[PDB]
Design a protein around this nucleic acid. Sequence first.
RNA 1: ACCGAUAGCGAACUAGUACCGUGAGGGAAAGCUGAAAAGCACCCCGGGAGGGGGGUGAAAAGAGCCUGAAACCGGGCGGCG
RNA 2: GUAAGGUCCGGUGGAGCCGCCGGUAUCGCGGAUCCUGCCGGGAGUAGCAGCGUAGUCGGGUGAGAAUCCCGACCGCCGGAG
RNA 3: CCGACACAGGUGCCCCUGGGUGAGAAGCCUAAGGCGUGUCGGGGGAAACCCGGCCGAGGGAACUCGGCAAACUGGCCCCGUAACUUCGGGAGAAGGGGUGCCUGCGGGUGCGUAACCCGCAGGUCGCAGUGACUAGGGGGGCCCGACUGUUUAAUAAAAA
RNA 4: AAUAGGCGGCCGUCGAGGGCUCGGGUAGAAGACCCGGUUGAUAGGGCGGGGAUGUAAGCGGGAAGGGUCAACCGACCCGCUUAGUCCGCCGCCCCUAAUCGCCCGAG
Lengths: 363, 151, 60, 49, 94
Amino acid sequence: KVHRPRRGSLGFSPRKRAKSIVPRIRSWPKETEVRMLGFAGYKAGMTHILMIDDEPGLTNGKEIFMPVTIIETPPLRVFGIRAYRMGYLGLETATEVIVPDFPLDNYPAKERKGKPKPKMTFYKLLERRIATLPKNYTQEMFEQKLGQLEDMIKEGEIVDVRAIVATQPWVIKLKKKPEVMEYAIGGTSVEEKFNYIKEKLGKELRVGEVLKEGELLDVIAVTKGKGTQGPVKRWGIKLRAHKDSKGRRKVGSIGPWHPARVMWTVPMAGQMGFHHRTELNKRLIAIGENGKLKLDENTEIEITPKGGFPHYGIVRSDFMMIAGSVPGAIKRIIRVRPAIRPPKKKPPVQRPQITYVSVESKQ
Amino acid sequence: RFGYSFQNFDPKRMARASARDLRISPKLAVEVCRELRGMMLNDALRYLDDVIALKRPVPLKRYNDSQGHKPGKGFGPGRYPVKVAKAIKKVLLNVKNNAVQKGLDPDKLKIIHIAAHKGPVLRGWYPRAFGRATPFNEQTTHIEVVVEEIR
Amino acid sequence: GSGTATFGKRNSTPTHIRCRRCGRVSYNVKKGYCAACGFGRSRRLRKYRWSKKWKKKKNA
Amino acid sequence: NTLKMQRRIAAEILKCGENRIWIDPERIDDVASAITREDIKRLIKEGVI
Amino acid sequence: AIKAGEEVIFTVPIKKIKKIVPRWKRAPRAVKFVREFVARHAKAQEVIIDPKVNEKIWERGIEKPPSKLRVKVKVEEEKREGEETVRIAYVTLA
RNA sequence: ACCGAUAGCGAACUAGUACCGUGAGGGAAAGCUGAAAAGCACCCCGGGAGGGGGGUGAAAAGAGCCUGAAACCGGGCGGCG
RNA sequence: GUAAGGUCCGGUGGAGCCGCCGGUAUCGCGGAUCCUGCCGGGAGUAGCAGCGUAGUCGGGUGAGAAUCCCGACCGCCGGAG
RNA sequence: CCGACACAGGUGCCCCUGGGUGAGAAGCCUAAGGCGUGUCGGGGGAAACCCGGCCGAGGGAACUCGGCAAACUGGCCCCGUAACUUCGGGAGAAGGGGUGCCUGCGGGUGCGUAACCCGCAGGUCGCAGUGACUAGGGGGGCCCGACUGUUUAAUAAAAA
RNA sequence: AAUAGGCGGCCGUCGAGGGCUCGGGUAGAAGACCCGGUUGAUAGGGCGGGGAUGUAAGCGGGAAGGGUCAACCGACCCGCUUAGUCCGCCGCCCCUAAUCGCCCGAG
Ligand SMILES: [Zn+2]
C-alpha cells in the first residue's frame, strides 16, 4: 500500500477549550542571575521593519524585511510573596503573604459633571479578581507575617519562593479587572530570592528592568478561537472524491471491523483554536518607552501606526517589539519567559540595526 | 373523570379543583406540576406567569430528549411550556375561588397535592408515502389539585 | 408510468352505469348489457351456481 | 363581516377587477351594514366605495 | 429620561442587523430593530411606528433598508384600565 | 347432557348495512344506568368546555352510565439510591 | 397440599352459587415471523425547506389575532398562477 | 375531477393573449386581471456538515475505467472555406474582421419629411458595445447500423 | 489522583459568595467563556483621525454638426472638485441606554 504521515499530531490532545484564559507556565529556565523570569503584556498588533541581520546564517550583514509584533506592557505590580516546601510527591505551598492596602495613584481618574474624583485605591481593583480580601489588615500584621515567613526560610522548610504580581489594564485604559500571576525568580539561594521579592513588594516592575533586548524568549498565550471545525480544517484530511454523493469534507472510514470500536486517533470534528500554546525561541527586537521608539539617539517615533492599531487603541505605555507572530487574538494577555531550550549559536544580546520602521496605516 | 388521588381530604382545611380533557401535552404538564407541587398558591401563580412571559425556564427531569440547556444554575434541560402553563393557571384560579368561597384565606394556601394524568386519545390519520396512512393523535390531560390553609 | 399518472385518465365515460332491471351499477353502456343480471342480452336472469351474491341478497 | 360579497358586487357594478375597488377605511361599519346591491350602489354614489 | 409631551431626535443605526439575517429578511428585521431600539431608549411599554416611517424603511425593497434612520420620538402616558401608567412612544420621520 | 356477545348464522342492534374493486364480486365493527329519571333545582368561578359547593338515589350506578382485571401512566407511602 | 390446587380472613358487588356420587364435552397456554382488541420504549423526536424563499406599518373586530377585515407600501405570475 | 390526501403526478394547453427590447407565441421588465393559500411562524457572524449558486493566484487532465461535472464558443453583417462524395452534400467545415451612443446625409417601396427596411461620413465614451437577457465550441482516425422512425410503462434506447 | 491534594483570605456555628435580568465579543450550535455595568467610555450619538472607490448633484463654458447656418438641440469634455458616497476600524465628549426587580445559598 501507499504510505504517508498521519493527518495532524497526537501530541496536542485533547483539543479542548483552554482551562483558563490566563495562560499557565509549567516549567521555568535555570538562570544564575537574580531576576524575575518573565513578564506579561497585551497583544496590540503587527507591523514590519527593515534591519541589518546579525543572526548567523546566509543573510548576515544584509538588510532584510522582518515582521514584528507589538505587546503593550504597562508596569506590573508586585503584591505577594509565596513560599514552597518539599512535599511527599512534589512542591507544596507553605505560606503566602500579600501587602496591605495602599493608595493607587496611577489610576486615570476623570472629573465628570458632579461628584469629586473617585479617589481609587488598591484592594478595590483587585476585588474584581479575588472578591475576598483581608480586612483590618495593618502594617504590623504584614510585618509579623513576613517575619514568620523569613523564620521559616531560616529553619529551612522552604525550598522555593515566588512572586505574586498583578496586571494594571487601567493605566493604559484597556479595562479594570486585573490578572494575577505567579512568577518564579531566577537564582539559587532562597534567601537571595526572598530579599529580591521583599524589596519590591508593593512596588512596580518595568519590562525594561526585567528583560534584555535581543534575547530569546518563549511566548505563552491562548490562541484565537475558531469554534467547531470539521476534520478537513481541524486535522488536514484530504477531500473525498468529487463524485461522492454523501459529502466531501468528511473522513471516509472511521475504522476497520476489528477492533470493534472507534479508535481515539481517527480525525473528528470538535473545538479548534482557543488552546494553550507555547512558542519557543522568539527574539526580542526592542523595548520602547511610553509608546515611543528611539532609533539613533536623536530620532524617536511613535510606534502606533496612523489611525491606530486595528481593533485596538493607541500604545501609550512601555511595549515590546518581538520578531515574528505570536498566538492570541487582539488584546489577549501574553506571557513571556526567557528561552527555555535556546539554540547553541544564539544571536547577540543587543538591539539590531533598524533602518526603517513601518508606521503607515495598517487598516 | 371525577375522582381524586388524594387520601385525607377534608372540607374544613382543604380546597380542590380539577380539569378534564385538556388539549395539552401530558408530559410537559407532569414536568410543570413537579415544580408546582409544594408551593404557595400566589408564588405558583407568579411562577406560571413568568413561564408564560418567557422569563423563567421550567427544568426537565424525565422527558428531556434533544433539549438544549439554559443560562443559570441547574440547567440542564429546560423549556417554556406556555400552553400548559396557561391551562394550569385556570385550574389554580379555580381552586383559589373554591377556597375563598369555602372561607379559607387565599394568602395562606399551600399546594399540598397536584397531579396530571393522561386522558382519552383523539384519533386521526396522516397520509404518508407509498400508500401508507399513519396515526396522528391528540393526547388530552387531566389535572387535579388540592391546597391546604397553613396555620 | 402504469401507476398514479395512468390513474388520472379515468375521466372518460364510465364502463358501467345503473341497470334498469337489477338496480346495480353494472350495466355495460358501450356494449349494452349488464354484467350482473344480463339485462339487454338475456331474457332470463344471469345466475351461476358458483356465484353467491344472489343468495347473499336474500340471506339464503 | 368579511366584505367579499360587497367587494365582488361593487366590482361587477363598476365593471372592473376586484383589486381596483377602494373601500373607505373609516366607513367599514356602513360597508358591512349595506347588504343589498341597492345599498352598495348607494355607497358607491356617496363615495365610500 | 424622556417626559410626556416632549419630543426627541434619534438616529437608529439599522446597519447593525444587516449581516445577521438573510438579505431578503432585512426590511422587516429593520422594522423590528427600530421598534426595539425606540422601546429601550424611551423606556416605553409600547411604541407606535408611523406608516410614513414604515414606507421610508421599505422604500428600496425588502433587501435594502436604510443604513441609518432619523426619527422623532414623543412619549405619552396612558394610565387607562388601571394597568399602571403604560408609556406609549410615537415614532415619526425626521 | 348445543352457544352465551372475539362464542352462536356474516348479521342478538337503522346487516348482506356501512365501506373496497371499472367489473365479475368481496364485506365489517357495534348488547347492559337505575326499582322509579327521581336524568342534579339553586350558589361561586370560567370566553366556553366544564370545576367547586349543594341536592336525587339503598348504592352515582351521572348518561363518556351493571361489575371495572391486566398491560401502561401520574401522586403518596416503605426500601435502595 | 411434594403439586395440579383448595379453603379461610379484610375490601368492592348487588344475584345467584357450591360439596359428594354417576355420566357427558368446542374441557386446561408462552410460543405456530399464530388470530382479534388494547397499551408501551423509539418521542415531545422526524417531518411541517429544496420545484414560485413574502410580507410590513397604522386602524377594526373579538374573551382571545403572525394567520380574519379595510388603507398604504413592498412583492410574485403575467403565451398563465 | 382520478390517483386512500387541501398528492410538485395525470386529466385540460381544451379554446384566447396589451406595451418595450427583440425574427419571434423565446428570455427579461411591465399594463389589465389575479394573488400574498405552490400556507407553520420567530431568533442568529448561532458553528461543523449537507444540498442549490458565484468567484478563485501559478500550472492546465498530472484526476479518473473513461475530460463524469464544469469551462471555452455563442446573435447578426462581411470576407473565406478542406479530405471525401451517391454531385444533392460535407457547410454555419475550418479560419479572420466588425458590432454602443450622438450629429447629419444618401437609397428602396411609397402622394407623403406617414410606415418598414438598406448604406455612407464625422465626433465621442469604457476593461468590456449580440455590455443584461437570448445565444453552436472545434478538428482528425476506426467498428457497427444506410437514412427519418420503433422498443423491454418501473435498472438495458442499443450494433436490437 | 478513593491516600478524592496544598496555601492565603472571607463567611457560619441574619448571612460571605453566586444566578436570572442589562450594554457588548478577546467567545460561541444550546450551555459555557470574556469585558463593562454610574465605583462608567460597554454600545448608540456628535466631532476628529485613518481608510475604500474615484471627482457627485447643480451651474458656467466648449463640443462633431443641424437649424432662418438665428433662437434652440447635441453624445461627450473642461472648472467649482482629492470631490461626493460609505466605512462590520481608531481617539475625545456621559448627550442617550447599561435601570428597576426577582431567586439560590453553608449554618
Ligand atoms: Zn342488471
